[model samples]
Structures are given as C-alpha cells and as structure tokens.
Target: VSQPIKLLVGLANPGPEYAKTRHNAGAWVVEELARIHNVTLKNEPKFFGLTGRLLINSQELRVLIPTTFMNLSGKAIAALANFYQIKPEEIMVAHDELDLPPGVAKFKQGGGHGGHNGLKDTISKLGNNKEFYRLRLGIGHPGHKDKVAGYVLGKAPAKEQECLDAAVDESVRCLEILMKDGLTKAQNRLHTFKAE
Candidate 1:
C-alpha cells in the first residue's frame, strides 16, 4: 500500500541569517526529526539539497531540505522526485503558515499554496498537483498584509519563539503518528496542541 508518505520536505531559504527566521519553522521540524532518527543529511548535488534516508515503521522515508532560495524550492523537489519516482501524493511539505497564530500547527491536504512562494513553486513543479500533504507550522500574521514579508523573514519575539519551539516539538510527535497511524489520527492529536 502506497498510502503512507515517503518524502518529507522542509521549505526555507538557505543561509545562516535565515536560520532562525519564522520562515524556517518548517526546517526546525525536519532537523529535529533527523536528530531523533540519528540521520545525517548530506549535500546531494543531484537533488540540489541535503538529503537523508531512514526507516519509520519499517517503511523507507526520505527527508529533504532544499538548499535553494525559497522560491526555487520546486526545482530541487522535482529533481529528487523524478530520480526516485516518488509521487506527488507521497510527499509531505513542512512550511511556515501565516494564517494561524504561533504555538499552533496543523496538517492540511490537497489545497492551494495560499500565496506561499515555496508551495506555489512546489505545486507548479509537481505538474500543478496540489494533493501533497502539508504540515502548516503556524507563525501567526503581522496584523497587516504589507508587513508580512518583513515579518516572516524576521525572527520572532522571545515569547513567540518559545511558543514556536513548543509547537515544533509537538509536530515531531505528530509526524510519528502520521507514519504509524494515518493522517486523520495525526490531525486529531496535533490540532489540539497549545502553548501557554
């Protein structure tokens, strides 16, 4: 059965400065998952990113962090997927979400990119297929549309950072459940997460 996901993708700009920005919240989850699995991601030129292979629930799983700028993320993903023959439905993308507030994260499936450049490009590169899974790492909104660019590219406040960390930690658990149980089970648990 190909129901379980095979590829886990994290979206973020590649650079030291962008490391702690709110946009990298998705990367946080993948990095933590790799750490827990003791998987070392190596720079793979063919994939245009850092990639690692590991096992979850006795099934093969590939974790990827595109080394390209946020907008060109699709190129790397397409390259890797083509080489591995991974299907669009077998991929799960983790990226920051502006609609939900900090300390909250959700699993969304088969939707538009919602103006996220990374997802927009990813969707296009995947032959306009938007059926992949998404781990929406909530970064909250800036209260105004014009401020969104600066807000997402900037680091969060100390308190908000703490909340994001808590959400990220919980997200790792959610991934485990998704791999073992299923999407619905993972959502049921993760949608209830909160940070006070």
Candidate 2:
C-alpha cells in the first residue's frame, strides 16, 4: 500500500480546567478511541504531544494529542507527521465543529478551516494545504457570534452535554468503517442511525 493513513490528530489544550469544556470535544473522541484500543497517549518531546502507536483493525496507526494550547495545535501535528514522513492527506484531524449541532458528527476531508483556531494553525503549518481529513465532533452553536467564545470555553448545559456525548458515541461506532471502508465510504456512514 502506498502511504496509507498514518496520523490521527486529536485537538485539545492541556489542563484540568479545560478538561470537560466544549473546546475539548476533540479529546473526548480521542479518549474513547484510546480506551477502546487499550493505549495511552504518552508525552514525547519529539512530537511535543501525547503520542501513541497502535494497531487498529489490523492497521498500524499513530495517534496524537497536541500538548500545546489550541492556537498552536499545528506545531505538535507537524512535528510528529514530518518526523514520520506522513503527508497532509495521510493525517486526520479530529476536532469539535461549531457549525454543527451537538448530536452530530461528520467525516470530511480537505476543506477550509472554518475559522477554527486549531484548524487555522494546522493549515498554516501544512503550508496552507487543507488536504487533511477531519472528523468533526459537533458542539452546537450558542446562537450568537459574541457568545461563541464563551460557549466553546464554557461547559455545555446538561442536555447539550448529553447530546455531545452521544455524538461521540456514534462516531466511535463508525470506527470499523473508517478503517476498512475508507474515507469516502465513511462519510455517508457517519451518522448511520440516530442516537435516540
């Protein structure tokens, strides 16, 4: 196989205070994947992130969570990928998507950053190339532009949080399809059945 997917980048800041915040939605999905795979993201100076290598569905994969704060996300991603010679198209950035509601997740590849700080930084580091795949974890919107920063950094209300968690659960269900059926196939399977 020629240069199959090698990197799974999860976006989140490092700190207890930010642990359950909406902004850390990216980490939630990563946490589940790690738990399911029985691996931990140990810190590595070379990657400047919590990194782990695992075999998923019989395929070797490198997973990363940038230890740096959100805006500087690209630093860790670039470090690990470049050192491994993984190209932009070979990386998948899993992040929280504000444009979508809390009960949804989507599989998409190569698009603009949508003003997301993490994606913005990743794009900047990739020489402005947006070819990396993105597993967008929906966090829902606050219904106003000014409320966004607060909304993202704030805790989702109880009901929204439930939906958020359900969304990740759905995405986790699609894992086999992602590893076997491929990106394009997984896109249509993202929300296979409603969470109920």
Candidate 3:
C-alpha cells in the first residue's frame, strides 16, 4: 500500500530475434502484466530501459525490462534501484528457470543464481541475493547438453506453445495476487494449481 513495490524486473534480451523464445519467457510475463494493467512500457533513453506502472489497492507498481541485453541486466536494475532509493526487498524479478518442468512457476525469496546469467549479474551488482523476491518461470532442460542453448533460444515446440501461453496468463494473474496478498498467500494460490 505504501507507494506499491518500487520495481518488478523481468530478465530478458531485447529485439525481435528474442521474442517468442523460451529464454524470453520473463519478458512475456512482463508484457502480459502491461496488458492486464493497461500500462505502456515506453523506452526511456536515460535509463536504457522500458517501464510502466500500475495502481492496485492504492499502491503503484513499476515494471521494468532492461534494454541492456541479458547478462548486463543488473546494471539497469541497480541503476533504477539507486535512482529511486528502493530497497532490495521491494524488487521482484521474473525470469526463466531451466530446472522445473515447463508450465510450472515458483516464487522464492532468493539464493544462488543457479547459473542464470541475468540473475548472476543482478546478484553481483546488488552485492547480495537474499533480499529480493524471484518469480521463476520454468522452461525445463534440454535432453542433451549440445541442445541446451537451442532449446532456450528457440521457440517452444508447437505442442508446447499452448501450455506456455497458459503459463504466461496464469503468471500475470499470480503477480496481481502477489501484490495484493503477499508472497505466502500468492504461492499458496498458484503453486498448486493444476496445469493442463
């Protein structure tokens, strides 16, 4: 209720090449948020970013997607955090996770980056990972090591696209619930929902 949470960062690379890829799922979530909130993510040259905000329950929430490419995401996030004087705890990041099954979403306080470049950079820049919240969108792992990058960068298979769409839709709703009810309640409502 107090000025809403200052920022919700979605980790992803910019440009058309990355759109619709599994690695860009976080961006998809943020885009969905923009749609649901009727907000626009206009580019801000000074911030080297795109951002929009929405008000719910008298709270204003800002959503950001850095234009600095994926591995360098931390620079933009840290800059925004410092410019706004926002604490680490007030920031939430949505990103793709290769560990869980596709269509599954998990929320957690913080930990190691799990080899995610964006998260690694953010953690390094922030100097700690314990304070921030994470919304991890599962993309699952490639069956073979040689195919990992392709799997992450390529579009979801035809059969999987519908499920991913459903996941994105659900994630947007979960973000709203998270803002209204806090993490525990949001998790309870989302973590157990059956995905088809």
Q: Which candidate leads in TM-score?
A: 1
TM-score of 2: 0.93
Winner of 2 and 3 under lDDT: 2
Candidate 3 residue 147 Cα shift, in angstroms, is 2.9
Worst 10 residues of 1 by lDDT: 1-10
TM-score of 3: 0.93
* Candidate 1 lDDT score relative to the true structure: 0.91
Best-to-worst order by lDDT is: 1, 2, 3
**Could you tally the backbone clashes for each prediction?**
0, 0, 0
lDDT by residue (1-196, candidate 2, tens digit) is 2224788888998889998999888888888888888997898978878999888677888899888989999999999988999999999888989988888898777898887899999999987889998889888787789888888899898888888889887786675567776665666788564444
Model 2 residue runs over 4 Å out of place are 1-4
Q: Which stretches of model 1 miss by more than 4 angstroms?
A: 1-3
Worst 10 residues of 2 by lDDT: 187-196
Error of 2 at 102 (Å): 0.5
Best by lDDT: 1
lDDT of 3: 0.81
| Residue pairs in clash, model 2 | none
Which residue pairs in candidate 1 collide?
Answer: none
Model 2, residue 45: C-alpha shift (Å): 2.2
